[PDB]
């Protein structure tokens, strides 16, 4: 079995009935309207449903006849691409290496060495990428896409003045040749080696070799021009920075395209973030934050070595979503575990040749973009506040519910929240929109605020809402959810010059979360010891990422300072009361 033999035979990602669609979307704007807004918004969807609607939906079954994907490129550019503010911090997704739960523990010195071994366990897995030897994912007997497992080698972003492209260099043997070079970031410079060595990949004491050379040239020397903190800036600032970056010297895109073309860009940092299985959030802060000067925000997965032999990820969230990630930084975390984190094959360093340095040709207005470039990043960045903690009926469902009841409880009011539920039974499905605010659950939190309310009440109205959310969730993994179709009416409108339909305009559809205006922006990272974070999707909103173990629960989350109502560490702290609650009310509610 290949690990991509699959692709040719996954269906088209549906297009839901309109009907369907329209009406759990007026059942999902209730908890935010009265009476009359009601009134008037069913008013403008049964109108939508009979007229404009009905002649859009239309248009995009026959968009559905034609793409066995028919949202995948709109989502691409609309979501990502078309975007202008920094995606660096703001959209790339981040997540710290769990090594440090066993056999890695954080201690000074062991920077170089650990991370020989993370390139080689890195290496491999993309050998196992190539050779299409990765397992492919199955829902019970059922194959997933796995077609975001090609954007995490090779693959870079590159800005452009009104929009982004995604370049995807990798290729399986069965395709081609496919770049052996990885890219490296130290002191504000840029050096690249090729991965492969008479035919075989190089070792974890050749790799040290390599690291090591790099990081003493640079350490006693000044950091240089810091080209990649352009990467962190405005979308058309970078675009134009970057033209003017080329046109300096024709090589210099030569430069670009080597760090591009990288396997993955590696970073050497010199920070030392306080991580301990119990505390570790500070992590997630210099992931996030951190030195631009050698950090390149357009690439798809870019590893990140600290001093105190810890380890993180940045990734452009645009070409994939987090799971990719996920398993590969489970497939390392396996390695390092069954080695005990260490290399215990041959000592011996082949003569390859040395690590060589990308020399950018710059001037003054270079060097003027580029210390904007990181004071903007790290202004902005200082404004983010991150908490990250570990608490020790779907698990998935309980957490999702959980986060409705605290934020409810925190902020006197339910909180539209976004939840992802991936699509992947098809062809190139990405992701869906999974409204965890129902009106179930509002009607479960009053009652548990609610002083007259019984155990039993508490307790059926929780498990109505459990079901809501099951359903829910089922339903939208299986592309009957409603947000993306609902864009799809939008663009297909938009793309032939047709007005802007009402429904849009509504108040109740911005209220309820529509156009990216979730409070509350929540993702599984699922049940491989992995976590990650974004920051929230709107300003006074919050990011509300975990993942799943056996015996625990583990919970990032971020919000903005400069929002004064909001506070991640309540938060966290109010929903694992939440849990405690919920749990109570079935023992108490045995009976």
Same mark, same amino acid.
């Given at each position: 079995?290949?690990?991509?033999?699959?692709?040719?035979?996954?269906?088209?990602?549906?297009?839901?009935?309109?009907?369907?669609?329209?009406? %759990?979307?007026?059942?999902?704007?209730?908890?935010?309207?009265?009476?009359?807004?009601?009134?008037?918004?069913?008013?403008?969807?049964?109108?939508?449903?009979?007229?404009?609607?009905?002649?859009?939906?239309?248009?995009?079954?026959?968009?559905?006849?034609?793409?066995?994907?028919?949202?995948?490129?709109?989502?691409?550019?609309?979501?990502?691409?078309?975007?202008?503010?920094?995606?660096?911090?703001?959209?790339?997704?981040?997540?710290?290496?769990?090594?440090?739960?066993?056999?890695?523990?954080?201690?000074?010195?062991?920077?170089?060495?650990?991370?020989?071994?993370?390139?080689?366990?890195?290496?491999?897995?993309?050998?196992?990428?190539?050779?299409?030897?990765?397992?492919?994912?199955?829902?019970?007997?059922?194959?997933?896409?796995?077609?975001?497992?090609?954007?995490?080698?090779?693959?870079?972003?590159?800005?452009?003045?009104?929009?982004?492209?995604?370049?995807?260099?990798?290729?399986?043997?069965?395709?081609?040749?496919?770049?052996?070079?990885?890219?490296?970031?130290?002191?504000?410079?840029?050096?690249?080696?090729?991965?492969?060595?008479?035919?075989?990949?190089?070792? *974890?004491?050749?790799?040290?070799?390599?690291?090591?050379?790099?990081?003493?040239?640079?350490?006693?020397?000044?950091?240089? *021009?810091?080209?990649?903190?352009?990467?962190?800036?405005?979308?058309?600032?970078?675009?134009?920075?970057?033209?003017?970056?080329?046109?300096?010297?024709?090589?210099?895109?030569?430069?670009?395209?080597?760090?591009?073309?990288?396997?993955?860009?590696?970073?050497?940092?010199?920070?030392?973030?306080?991580?301990? *299985?119990?505390?570790?959030?500070?992590?997630?802060?210099?992931?996030?934050?951190?030195?631009?000067?050698?950090?390149?925000?357009?690439?798809?997965?870019?590893?990140?070595?600290?001093?105190?032999?810890?380890?993180?990820?940045?990734?452009?969230?645009?070409?994939?979503?987090?799971?990719?990630?996920?398993?590969?930084?489970?497939?390392?975390?396996?390695?390092?575990?069954?080695?005990?984190?260490?290399?215990?094959?041959?000592?011996?360093?082949?003569?390859?040749?040395?690590?060589?340095?990308?020399?950018?040709?710059?001037?003054?207005?270079?060097?003027?973009?580029?210390?904007?470039?990181?004071?903007?990043?790290?202004?902005?960045?200082?404004?983010?506040?991150?908490?990250?903690?570990?608490?020790?009926?779907?698990?998935?469902?309980?957490?999702?519910?959980?986060?409705?009841?605290?934020?409810?409880?925190?902020?006197?009011?339910?909180?539209?929240?976004?939840?992802?539920?991936?699509?992947?039974?098809?062809?190139?499905?990405?992701?869906?929109?999974?409204?965890?605010?129902?009106?179930?659950?509002?009607?479960?939190?009053?009652?548990?605020?609610?002083?007259?309310?019984?155990?039993?009440?508490?307790?059926? %109205?929780?498990?109505?809402?459990?079901? %809501?959310?099951?359903?829910?969730? %089922?339903?939208?993994?299986?592309?009957?959810?409603?947000?993306?179709?609902?864009?799809?009416?939008?663009?297909?409108?938009?793309?032939?010059?047709?007005?802007?339909?009402?429904?849009?305009?509504?108040?109740?559809?911005?209220?309820?979360?529509?156009?990216?205006?979730?409070?509350?922006?929540?993702?599984?990272?699922?049940?491989?010891?992995?976590?990650?974070?974004?920051?929230?999707?709107?300003?006074?909103?919050?990011?509300?990422?975990?993942?799943?173990?056996?015996?625990?629960?583990?919970?990032?989350?971020?919000?903005?300072?400069?929002?004064?109502?909001?506070?991640?560490?309540?938060?966290?702290?109010?929903?694992?009361?939440?849990?405690?609650?919920?749990?109570?009310?079935?023992?108490?509610?045995?009976?």
């Amino acid at each position: 079995e290949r690990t991509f033999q699959y692709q040719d035979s996954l269906p088209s990602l549906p297009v839901p009935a309109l009907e369907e669609s329209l009406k %759990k979307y007026l059942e999902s704007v209730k908890p935010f309207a009265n009476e009359d807004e009601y009134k008037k918004t069913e008013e403008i969807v049964q109108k939508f449903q009979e007229g404009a609607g009905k002649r859009l939906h239309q248009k995009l079954l026959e968009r559905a006849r034609g793409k066995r994907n028919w949202l995948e490129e709109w989502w691409l550019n609309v979501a990502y691409l078309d975007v202008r503010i920094p995606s660096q911090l703001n959209v790339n997704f981040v997540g710290p290496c769990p090594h440090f739960e066993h056999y890695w523990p954080a201690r000074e010195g062991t920077q170089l060495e650990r991370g020989s071994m993370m390139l080689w366990h890195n290496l491999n897995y993309w050998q196992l990428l190539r050779r299409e030897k990765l397992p492919v994912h199955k829902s019970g007997n059922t194959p997933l896409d796995m077609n975001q497992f090609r954007m995490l080698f090779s693959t870079c972003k590159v800005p452009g003045i009104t929009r982004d492209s995604i370049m995807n260099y990798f290729k399986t043997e069965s395709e081609g040749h496919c770049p052996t070079h990885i890219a490296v970031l130290c002191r504000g410079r840029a050096f690249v080696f090729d991965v492969l060595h008479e035919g075989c990949l190089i070792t *974890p004491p050749e790799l040290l070799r390599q690291l090591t050379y790099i990081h003493k040239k640079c350490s006693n020397e000044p950091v240089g *021009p810091s080209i990649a903190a352009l990467t962190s800036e405005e979308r058309t600032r970078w675009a134009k920075a970057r033209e003017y970056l080329i046109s300096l010297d024709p090589e210099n895109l030569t430069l670009l395209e080597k760090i591009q073309t990288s396997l993955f860009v590696y970073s050497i940092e010199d920070s030392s973030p306080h991580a301990t *299985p119990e505390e570790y959030s500070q992590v997630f802060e210099m992931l996030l934050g951190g030195d631009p000067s050698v950090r390149w925000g357009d690439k798809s997965y870019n590893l990140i070595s600290f001093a105190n032999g810890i380890f993180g990820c940045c990734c452009d969230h645009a070409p994939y979503d987090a799971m990719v990630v996920v398993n590969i930084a489970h497939y390392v975390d396996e390695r390092v575990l069954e080695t005990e984190g260490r290399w215990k094959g041959s000592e011996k360093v082949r003569d390859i040749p040395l690590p060589e340095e990308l020399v950018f040709t710059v001037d003054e207005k270079i060097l003027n973009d580029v210390s904007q470039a990181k004071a903007q990043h790290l202004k902005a960045a200082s404004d983010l506040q991150i908490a990250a903690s570990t608490f020790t009926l779907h698990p998935d469902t309980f957490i999702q519910l959980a986060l409705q009841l605290a934020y409810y409880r925190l902020h006197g009011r339910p909180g539209c929240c976004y939840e992802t539920a991936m699509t992947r039974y098809f062809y190139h499905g990405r992701t869906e929109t999974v409204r965890s605010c129902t009106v179930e659950a509002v009607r479960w939190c009053q009652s548990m605020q609610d002083p007259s309310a019984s155990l039993l009440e508490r307790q059926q %109205k929780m498990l109505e809402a459990f079901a %809501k959310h099951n359903k829910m969730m %089922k339903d939208c993994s299986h592309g009957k959810g409603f947000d993306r179709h609902l864009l799809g009416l939008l663009l297909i409108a938009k793309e032939e010059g047709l007005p802007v339909p009402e429904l849009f305009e509504d108040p109740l559809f911005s209220r309820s979360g529509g156009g990216g205006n979730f409070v509350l922006s929540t993702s599984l990272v699922g049940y491989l010891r992995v976590q990650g974070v974004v920051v929230p999707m709107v300003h006074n909103g919050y990011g509300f990422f975990y993942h799943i173990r056996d015996d625990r629960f583990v919970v990032a989350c971020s919000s903005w300072r400069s929002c004064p109502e909001t506070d991640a560490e309540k938060l966290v702290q109010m929903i694992f009361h939440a849990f405690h609650d919920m749990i109570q009310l079935m023992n108490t509610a045995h009976l």
